[PDB]
Amino acid sequence: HSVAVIGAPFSQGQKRKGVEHGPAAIREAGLMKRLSSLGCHLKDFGDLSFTPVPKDDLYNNLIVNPRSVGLANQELAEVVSRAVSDGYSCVTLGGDHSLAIGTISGHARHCPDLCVVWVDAHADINTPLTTSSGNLHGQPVSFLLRELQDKVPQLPGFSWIKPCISSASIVYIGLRDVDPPEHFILKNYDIQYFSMRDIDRLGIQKVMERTFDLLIGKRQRPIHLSFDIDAFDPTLAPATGTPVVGGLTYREGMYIAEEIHNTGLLSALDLVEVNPQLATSEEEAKTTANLAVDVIASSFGQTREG
Amino acid sequence: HSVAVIGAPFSQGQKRKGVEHGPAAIREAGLMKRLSSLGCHLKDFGDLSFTPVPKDDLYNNLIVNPRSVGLANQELAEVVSRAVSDGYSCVTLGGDHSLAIGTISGHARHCPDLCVVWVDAHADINTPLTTSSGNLHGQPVSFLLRELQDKVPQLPGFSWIKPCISSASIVYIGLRDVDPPEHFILKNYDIQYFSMRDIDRLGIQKVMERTFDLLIGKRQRPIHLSFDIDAFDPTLAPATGTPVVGGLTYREGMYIAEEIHNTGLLSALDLVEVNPQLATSEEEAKTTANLAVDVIASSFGQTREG
Amino acid sequence: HSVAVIGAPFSQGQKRKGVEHGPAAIREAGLMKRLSSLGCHLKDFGDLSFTPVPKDDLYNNLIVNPRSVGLANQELAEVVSRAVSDGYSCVTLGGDHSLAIGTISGHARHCPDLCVVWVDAHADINTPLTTSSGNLHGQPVSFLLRELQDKVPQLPGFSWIKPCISSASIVYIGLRDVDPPEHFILKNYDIQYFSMRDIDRLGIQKVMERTFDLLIGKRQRPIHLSFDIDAFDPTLAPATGTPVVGGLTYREGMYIAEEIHNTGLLSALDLVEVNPQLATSEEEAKTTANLAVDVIASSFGQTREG
Numbered sequence: 080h081s082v083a084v085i086g087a088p089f090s091q092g093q094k095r096k097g098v099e100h101g102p103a104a105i106r107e108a109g110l111m112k113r114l115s116s117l118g119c120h121l122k123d124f125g126d127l128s129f130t131p132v133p134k135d136d137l138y139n140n141l142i143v144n145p146r147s148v149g150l151a152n153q154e155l156a157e158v159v160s161r162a163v164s165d166g167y168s169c170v171t172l173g174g175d176h177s178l179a180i181g182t183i184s185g186h187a188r189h190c191p192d193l194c195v196v197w198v199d200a201h202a203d204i205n206t207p208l209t210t211s212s213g214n215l216h217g218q219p220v221s222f223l224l225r226e227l228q229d230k231v232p233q234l235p236g237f238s239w240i241k242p243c244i245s246s247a248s249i250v251y252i253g254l255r256d257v258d259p260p261e262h263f264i265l266k267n268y269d270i271q272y273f274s275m276r277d278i279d280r281l282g283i284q285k286v287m288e289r290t291f292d293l294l295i296g297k298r299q300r301p302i303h304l305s306f307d308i309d310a311f312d313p314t315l316a317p318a319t320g321t322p323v324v325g326g327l328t329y330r331e332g333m334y335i336a337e338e339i340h341n342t343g344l345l346s347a348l349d350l351v352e353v354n355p356q357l358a359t360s361e362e363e364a365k366t367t368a369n370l371a372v373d374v375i376a377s378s379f380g381q382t383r384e385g
Numbered sequence: 386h387s388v389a390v391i392g393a394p395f396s397q398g399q400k401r402k403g404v405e406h407g408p409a410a411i412r413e414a415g416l417m418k419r420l421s422s423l424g425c426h427l428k429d430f431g432d433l434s435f436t437p438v439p440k441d442d443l444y445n446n447l448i449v450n451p452r453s454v455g456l457a458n459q460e461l462a463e464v465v466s467r468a469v470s471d472g473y474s475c476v477t478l479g480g481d482h483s484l485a486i487g488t489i490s491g492h493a494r495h496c497p498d499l500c501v502v503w504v505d506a507h508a509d510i511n512t513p514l515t516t517s518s519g520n521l522h523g524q525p526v527s528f529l530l531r532e533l534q535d536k537v538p539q540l541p542g543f544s545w546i547k548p549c550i551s552s553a554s555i556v557y558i559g560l561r562d563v564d565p566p567e568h569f570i571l572k573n574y575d576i577q578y579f580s581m582r583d584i585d586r587l588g589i590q591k592v593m594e595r596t597f598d599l600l601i602g603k604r605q606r607p608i609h610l611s612f613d614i615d616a617f618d619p620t621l622a623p624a625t626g627t628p629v630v631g632g633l634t635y636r637e638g639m640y641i642a643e644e645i646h647n648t649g650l651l652s653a654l655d656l657v658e659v660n661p662q663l664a665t666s667e668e669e670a671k672t673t674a675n676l677a678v679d680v681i682a683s684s685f686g687q688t689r690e691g
Numbered sequence: 692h693s694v695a696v697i698g699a700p701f702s703q704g705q706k707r708k709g710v711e712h713g714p715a716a717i718r719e720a721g722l723m724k725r726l727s728s729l730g731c732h733l734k735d736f737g738d739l740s741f742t743p744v745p746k747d748d749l750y751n752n753l754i755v756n757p758r759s760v761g762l763a764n765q766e767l768a769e770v771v772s773r774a775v776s777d778g779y780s781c782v783t784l785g786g787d788h789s790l791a792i793g794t795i796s797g798h799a800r801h802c803p804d805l806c807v808v809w810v811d812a813h814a815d816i817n818t819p820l821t822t823s824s825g826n827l828h829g830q831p832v833s834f835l836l837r838e839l840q841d842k843v844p845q846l847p848g849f850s851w852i853k854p855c856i857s858s859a860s861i862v863y864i865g866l867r868d869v870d871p872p873e874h875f876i877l878k879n880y881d882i883q884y885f886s887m888r889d890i891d892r893l894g895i896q897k898v899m900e901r902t903f904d905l906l907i908g909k910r911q912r913p914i915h916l917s918f919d920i921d922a923f924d925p926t927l928a929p930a931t932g933t934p935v936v937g938g939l940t941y942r943e944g945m946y947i948a949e950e951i952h953n954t955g956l957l958s959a960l961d962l963v964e965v966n967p968q969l970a971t972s973e974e975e976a977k978t979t980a981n982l983a984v985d986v987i988a989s990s991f992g993q994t995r996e997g
């Protein structure tokens with residue numbers, strides 16, 4: 080069993096400095112030794128260096144860094160595609176969540192029937208026409224879903240992106256901070272999600288059961304786990320850019336990762352939005368990074384009963 | 386779709402200074418804008434000034450400030466009754482919980498078939514003969530329940546009170562610090578409650594289902610939500626006079642408010658016992674006040690899924 | 692009902708200084724008054740002074756203080772046996788968990804059909820041949836289970852110990868940090884346990900129901916509750932030697948204890964591994980001690996509804 084680890088130190092999907100140090104923080108929290116201990120054969124691609132784009136002016140006087148986000152994701156997609164083709168499950172360390180454009184596009188290149196479990200406080204599904212921030216880390220899903228493309232204009236640097244995945248092939252877990260246009264999109268296209276309220280009602284066990292029934296109930300499919308650290312309650316993951324009270328507990332996050340592992344289908348994992356500079360203390364940064372490692376390790380078989 | 390906001394900066398139901406700054410603290414945490422954003426048409430009555438009573442000696446060498454508490458609640462009931470009479474859902478910001486004598490009396494004056502959801506670590510149902518503290522914020526329910534009245538002596542300043550609500554019309558949620566005579570009262574009058582232990586067993590979804598079955602399962606009734614901030618765990622609401630370990634989580638609190646909103650029957654709400662002076666830090670004070678705003682906003686339609 | 696309280700200030704089942712002050716910390720947090728208030732008639736045995744053993748060299752160049760742990764547990768077992776013989780429910784305050792060798796042996800002497808509820812982040816079931824630490828507080832169960840005795844070598848100071856419990860007669864709750872050889876032992880001898888993951892799935896009410904079904908579903912048996920304070924999440928019980936993230940909540944711990952009390956069969960209880968010196972602050976030490984008192988008190992009838 081082989082795992083590729085890719086550092087994607089990208090910050091231009093949003094405006095807060097420091098998320099580009101996420102990959103180093105996660106590495107320094109002991110990721111590689113944790114993965115080896117589970118028996119993973121590891122290939123470390125290091126931290127990628129993304130080609131900058133000169134004069135990357137705002138798109139439509141609103142969307143920030145469109146060409147840089149587009150080119151960095153193009154280059155990342157190529158690495159992910161290559162790594163999956165050589166048989167690695169792909170761990171990508173962010174960096175802001177706009178990198179999912181690249182990891183999912185690269186993943187889907189030769190696994191077009193993949194499915195997506197998006198663990199996040201946010202739906203990240205604004206389009207360039209609905210985003211009120213202009214930050215591409217809050218729009219990545221809009222570029223990936225086939226049903227949405229008549230409503231998604233073409234951004235400079237984005238022409239290489241072919242929407243691959245159907246709206247029936249992504250399930251959200253942990254939502255609690257959704258813009259009204261995103262809520263409209265989720266309803267209008269019948270995208271399935273389990274908000275914190277649904278977890279409050281159902282419990283995380285039934286949530287995972289219904290997630291896998293929706294996605295792999297009829298056939299086995301490679302799973303793409305896109306895990307935004309801010310799905311966890313801010314008391315557990317303070318060092319992140321958009322913290323929202325009322326998040327997953329530690330045990331709930333582990334349970335999600337455990338069930339991901341238990342399918343046997345995990346093919347790529349994003350761990351994004353760890354920003355150590357937003358911690359008010361070194362300890363706050365380290366617990367956030369330590370939590371990111373716990374998620375990744377549990378997703379590749381670390382158990383709580385030994 | 387109209388909401389009145391009444392500040393009741395009362396502290397004489399108990400002995401700790403500062404709870405009279407609850408209303409200002411909750412307002413400064415952004416309450417009015419949050420209510421407006423939901424579509425509430427707002428009438429702000431400001432903070433009331435209550436008439437002092439000269440020589441308000443202890444009653445029976447035990448009950449403190451009886452006439453002041455009686456008169457303040459008489460005046461508050463007057464304001465609540467006119468606001469409900471003019472079509473407003475009434476939000477009253479405390480202040481100690483003795484002001485529920487006034488808000489429920491004033492509410493019932495216009496809506497006599499109301500029912501009460503009392504969210505609290507405490508039962509607040511001591512009578513003047515069972516209280517061991519003498520503080521009227523630990524007795525408000527005893528003055529309101531019709532079946533208890535033969536055991537409730539008449540206090541100076543209380544003769545205006547018409548206790549007509551039945552013991553079958555109030556349900557408690559969150560109990561975990563109950564005096565032995567309060568436990569006797571709850572059992573002897575078959576008053577229904579969901580303690581923290583019941584929530585542990587049933588889960589908050591079934592707690593709310595069973596609460597509404599008891600109160601509105603036979604007919605629609607206006608709902609009075611009386612919410613003591615100390616129902617929440619002290620880690621979440623530290624700035625309060627009688628914190629008790631092992632309380633509601635944030636998510637459980639939001640879920641209660643959400644189900645209150647979902648009935649469509651919320652007619653008045655109390656948010657009581659925020660005392661910002663008991664915070665050990667400005668952070669603890671603001672967290673408690675922000676939590677209070679979250680409870681109120683969720684009770685009037687704020688969702689976690691947008 | 693009569694309760695004996697035995698301080699067992701023992702630290703040589705492990706290497707960290709200060710767990711011998713656990714009994715004094717728990718007493719200072721009000722234990723005796725809490726138990727009296729529940730109506731329990733109290734016999735206080737004080738803190739035992741265990742006989743030292745000169746030249747207590749490592750066994751097999753690994754196992755630390757074997758003769759001291761053997762002899763202290765022999766002396767403790769004698770005291771527990773006498774107290775249980777005299778009709779006391781036995782509360783033993785630790786001290787590290789190697790003292791369960793003594794309390795369970797003494798308890799089993801008069802009550803051979805006793806069953807064991809072991810509440811703990813750890814399984815404590817390494818043998819002298821599987822421990823990687825050499826610390827006897829991580830091995831006590833191996834000396835007590837009949838089915839394991841052909842694989843447990845005899846230690847200096849241990850020859851008095853007769854395995855008294857069958858592997859069907861112990862249930863674990865709270866496991867989350869299990870060594871591979873312990874996991875093998877648990878599965879190979881079909882020892883029943885509820886890990887944190889099981890609690891996440893079932894909820895603590897179902898966990899307790901199944902616990903008692905396994906243990907006393909056929910017949911009434913005296914219950915021995917061996918409660919390692921590190922079963923609780925470290926945010927709640929920080930002053931302990933091997934804290935593990937993702938533990939019991941406060942409410943779950945109270946619920947376990949309440950259900951223990953509700954059987955009416957509690958005959959002895961260990962409250963072990965409070966180490967006040969590992970607190971980074973006086974408050975951290977006191978919160979841990981207060982929690983220990985809450986466990987013991989709820990195990991003997993303290994309720995959350997009064």
Ligand SMILES: N[C@@]1(C(=O)O)CNC[C@@H]1CCC[B-](O)(O)O
Nearest residue numbers: 176201203205212216217258321
């Ligand atoms: N909907 C928002 C947006 O900007 O589109 C409005 N504010 C935050 C949220 C984006 C969160 C980005 B994520 O952290 O989840 O990668």
Ligand SMILES: N[C@@]1(C(=O)O)CNC[C@@H]1CCC[B-](O)(O)O
Nearest residue numbers: 482507509511518522523564627
């Ligand atoms: N039962 C008590 C009483 O004084 O009657 C004994 N101690 C506090 C409790 C009252 C709590 C008042 B509430 O905060 O719930 O408004």
Ligand SMILES: N[C@@]1(C(=O)O)CNC[C@@H]1CCC[B-](O)(O)O
Nearest residue numbers: 788813817824826828829870933
């Ligand atoms: N399995 C271990 C061992 O040393 O055997 C490895 N690390 C700690 C654990 C013992 C915990 C002892 B307890 O605290 O539960 O009394």
Ligand SMILES: [Mn+2]
Nearest residue numbers: 200201307309
């Ligand atoms: Mn997010």
Ligand SMILES: [Mn+2]
Nearest residue numbers: 176199203307
């Ligand atoms: Mn995201």
Ligand SMILES: [Mn+2]
Nearest residue numbers: 506507613615
């Ligand atoms: Mn209260």
Ligand SMILES: [Mn+2]
Nearest residue numbers: 482505509613
């Ligand atoms: Mn109250």
Ligand SMILES: [Mn+2]
Nearest residue numbers: 788811815919
């Ligand atoms: Mn132990």
Ligand SMILES: [Mn+2]
Nearest residue numbers: 812813919921
């Ligand atoms: Mn332990």
